[PDB]
Amino acid sequence: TSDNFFENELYSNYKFQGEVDQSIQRLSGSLQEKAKKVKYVPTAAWLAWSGATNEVARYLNEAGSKTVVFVLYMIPTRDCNAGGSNGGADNLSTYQGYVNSIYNTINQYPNSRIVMIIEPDTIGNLVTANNANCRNVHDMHKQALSYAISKFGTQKNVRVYLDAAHGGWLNSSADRTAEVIAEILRNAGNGKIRGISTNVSNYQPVYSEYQYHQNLNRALESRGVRGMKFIVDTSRNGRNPSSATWCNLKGAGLGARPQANPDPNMPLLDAYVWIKTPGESDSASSADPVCRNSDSLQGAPAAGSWFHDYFVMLLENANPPF
Numbered sequence: 001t002s003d004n005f006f007e008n009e010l011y012s013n014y015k016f017q018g019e020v021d022q023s024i025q026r027l028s029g030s031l032q033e034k035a036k037k038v039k040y041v042p043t044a045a046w047l048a049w050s051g052a053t054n055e056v057a058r059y060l061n062e063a064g065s066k067t068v069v070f071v072l073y074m075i076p077t078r079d080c081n082a083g084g085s086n087g088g089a090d091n092l093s094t095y096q097g098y099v100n101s102i103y104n105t106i107n108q109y110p111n112s113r114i115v116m117i118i119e120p121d122t123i124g125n126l127v128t129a130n131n132a133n134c135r136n137v138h139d140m141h142k143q144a145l146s147y148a149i150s151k152f153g154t155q156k157n158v159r160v161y162l163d164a165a166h167g168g169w170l171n172s173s174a175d176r177t178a179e180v181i182a183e184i185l186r187n188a189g190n191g192k193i194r195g196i197s198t199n200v201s202n203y204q205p206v207y208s209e210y211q212y213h214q215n216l217n218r219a220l221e222s223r224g225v226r227g228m229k230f231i232v233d234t235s236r237n238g239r240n241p242s243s244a245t246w247c248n249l250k251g252a253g254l255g256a257r258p259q260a261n262p263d264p265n266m267p268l269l270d271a272y273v274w275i276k277t278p279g280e281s282d283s284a285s286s287a288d289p290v291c292r293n294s295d296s297l298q299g300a301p302a303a304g305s306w307f308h309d310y311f312v313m314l315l316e317n318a319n320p321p322f
C-alpha cells in the first residue's frame with residue numbers, strides 16, 4: 001500500500017551473510033562480535049554481470065514478503081572510444097535482453113516488494129564526461145536508461161530509483177543533471193520512478209547529500225519532474241571523506257544502518273540504504289591510477305571481491321558504533 005517500500009522489513013541476503021561469515025571466521029573477541037551484528041544488516045543485491053539474470057529468482061524466493069533491493073548494473077559498455085565497430089554490436093539489444101529477462105522473472109512474484117536502482121555512475125558521466133569519443137556510448141546509455149525505466153517502472157511490485165551520482169560530483173551541475181534526467185523520463189514510455197539514488201559506492205555525508213537532493217529536486221521540478229523522493233547509500237559514509245578518492249578510501253566507516261523515513265526534517269528522503277556492499281573491493285589496487293592514491297587502501301583484490309582488511313576498517317570506523 002505505501003509507495004515507500006523501505007517501510008517494510010528489509011531482506012537480508014545469503015551472499016552478504018556469507019561474505020561477512022568470511023570475516024567473522026578471521027576475527028576473535030570484540031571485533032568478531034561486531035562483525036556478527038553487521039552480518040544481518042540488509043544490503044542491496046547487485047545485478048552486475050550477464051548471468052545475474054539467473055540470480056534474481058533465488059533472491060526473491062528467499063526474501064518472501066521482505067523488501068528486496070536490486071542494483072541494475074548491466075549496461076554492456078561504460079568505456080568510450082567506440083569508435084566502432086561501429087562502435088557497438090550490439091549493446092543496446094543485448095541490454096534490452098537482460099532487462100526483459102529480469103522483468104519477466106519479476107512478473108512471476110506479484111507479491112514481492114522490489115526496489116530497483118538503475119545503473120550507478122551512468123548519469124554522472126552523461127553530465128560531466130566529454131564525449132567526442134563517448135558520444136555514441138552516451139546516446140546508447142540514455143536509451144538504455146529509458147528502456148530500463150520503461151519496463152521496471154510499470155511493474156506494480158517494483159519501485160524504481162534512478163541513480164544520480166553524488167553531491168561531490170553533480171551538486172555544482174544540478175540543472176544539467178535535471179535536464180538529462182527529464183530527457184530520459186520523456187522516452188521511458190509509461191514507466192515511472194519513485195525517485196533518485198545518490199552516494200552509491202561513495203562516502204559523502206548524509207547532511208551534504210541531502211543539500212544535494214534539495215538542489216537536484218528544485219532543478220527536476222523546474223524541468224517538470226515533480227514529486228521525486230531520494231535514497232542515499234550509507235554503507236561507507238560514517239566518516240567525512242578526506243579527499244575525492246573513489247577507490248577503497250582509507251578512513252571510511254560504516255554509516256547509519258538502513259532505515260525508512262529516518263529524519264522528519266528530511267522529508268524528501270525515503271531511506272538510508274546500504275547500496276554499495278561494504279567490504280567488497282572497488283577495484284584492484286593495480287587496475288586504476290586512483291587506486292594508487294596515497295589515501296586508497298592498498299592490497300585490494302578485484303572489484304566486487306571481498307576485501308577483509310577494508311571491511312575491518314569500516315567496522316572499526318563505524319558511525320554510529322556497533
Ligand SMILES: [N+]
Pocket residue numbers: 004261270
Ligand atoms: N515515505
Ligand SMILES: [N+]
Pocket residue numbers: 064065109110111112113
Ligand atoms: N513473493
Ligand SMILES: [N+]
Pocket residue numbers: 120121163164165166197198199200201
Ligand atoms: N550514486
Ligand SMILES: [N+]
Pocket residue numbers: 203236237238239240241251252253254
Ligand atoms: N566514511
